[PDB]
Design a protein around this motif. Structure first.
Motif, PDB file in Angstrom:
ATOM      1  N   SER A  42      38.283  36.037  39.536  1.00  0.00           N
ATOM      2  CA  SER A  42      37.757  35.696  40.841  1.00  0.00           C
ATOM      3  C   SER A  42      37.298  36.947  41.587  1.00  0.00           C
ATOM      4  O   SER A  42      37.670  38.062  41.225  1.00  0.00           O
ATOM      5  N   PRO A  43      36.469  36.787  42.628  1.00  0.00           N
ATOM      6  CA  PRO A  43      36.055  37.900  43.485  1.00  0.00           C
ATOM      7  C   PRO A  43      37.195  38.394  44.376  1.00  0.00           C
ATOM      8  O   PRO A  43      37.109  39.463  44.982  1.00  0.00           O
ATOM      9  N   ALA A  44      38.266  37.613  44.444  1.00  0.00           N
ATOM     10  CA  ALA A  44      39.407  37.946  45.288  1.00  0.00           C
ATOM     11  C   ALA A  44      40.426  38.806  44.547  1.00  0.00           C
ATOM     12  O   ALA A  44      41.447  39.199  45.115  1.00  0.00           O
ATOM     13  N   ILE A  45      40.148  39.098  43.283  1.00  0.00           N
ATOM     14  CA  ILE A  45      41.044  39.919  42.482  1.00  0.00           C
ATOM     15  C   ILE A  45      41.097  41.340  43.046  1.00  0.00           C
ATOM     16  O   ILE A  45      40.065  41.988  43.233  1.00  0.00           O
ATOM     17  N   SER A  46      42.298  41.813  43.347  1.00  0.00           N
ATOM     18  CA  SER A  46      42.447  43.089  44.035  1.00  0.00           C
ATOM     19  C   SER A  46      43.598  43.913  43.462  1.00  0.00           C
ATOM     20  O   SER A  46      44.474  43.380  42.780  1.00  0.00           O
ATOM     21  N   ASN A  47      43.549  45.222  43.712  1.00  0.00           N
ATOM     22  CA  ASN A  47      44.671  46.136  43.462  1.00  0.00           C
ATOM     23  C   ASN A  47      45.087  46.172  41.989  1.00  0.00           C
ATOM     24  O   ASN A  47      46.278  46.206  41.668  1.00  0.00           O
ATOM     25  N   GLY A  48      44.107  46.177  41.089  1.00  0.00           N
ATOM     26  CA  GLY A  48      44.404  46.322  39.674  1.00  0.00           C
ATOM     27  C   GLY A  48      45.084  45.105  39.085  1.00  0.00           C
ATOM     28  O   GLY A  48      45.737  45.198  38.044  1.00  0.00           O
ATOM     29  N   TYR A  49      44.921  43.956  39.733  1.00  0.00           N
ATOM     30  CA  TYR A  49      45.526  42.722  39.255  1.00  0.00           C
ATOM     31  C   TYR A  49      44.926  42.292  37.920  1.00  0.00           C
ATOM     32  O   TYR A  49      45.567  41.575  37.158  1.00  0.00           O
ATOM     33  N   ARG A  50      43.709  42.747  37.631  1.00  0.00           N
ATOM     34  CA  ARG A  50      43.077  42.450  36.352  1.00  0.00           C
ATOM     35  C   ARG A  50      43.938  42.990  35.223  1.00  0.00           C
ATOM     36  O   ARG A  50      44.059  42.379  34.163  1.00  0.00           O
ATOM     37  N   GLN A  51      44.547  44.138  35.477  1.00  0.00           N
ATOM     38  CA  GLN A  51      45.410  44.789  34.519  1.00  0.00           C
ATOM     39  C   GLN A  51      46.693  43.995  34.322  1.00  0.00           C
ATOM     40  O   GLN A  51      47.211  43.904  33.211  1.00  0.00           O
TER      41      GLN A  51
END
Length: 75
Positions: free
Chosen positions: A16-25
């Motif tokens: 999502s575009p709301a993904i923040s603070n290295g949450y992808r990791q």
């Protein structure tokens, strides 16, 4: 159990575009990447978990974790 009454399957088209603070990791660590798919088992009407199937094992997560992903259903 081999899934539980599958109504629809939803794919993960990406994050999502709301993904923040290295949450992808964090998601990558958890095994959440674009290209995968979840087969619905059920969500609790209270609010949310998410019981789904992936291939041979059921998976569960929350709405806030789901909010880091963008899903696209089969139909």
């Amino acid at each position: 159990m081999s899934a539980l009454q599958p109504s629809r399957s939803y794919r993960i088209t990406g994050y999502s575009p709301a993904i923040s603070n290295g949450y992808r990791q964090r998601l990558f660590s958890m095994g959440l990447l674009p290209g995968a798919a979840l087969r619905v088992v059920r969500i609790a009407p209270l609010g949310d978990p998410i019981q789904v199937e992936t291939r041979q094992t059921s998976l569960a997560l929350r709405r806030k974790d789901l909010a880091l992903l963008t899903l696209v259903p089969l139909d």
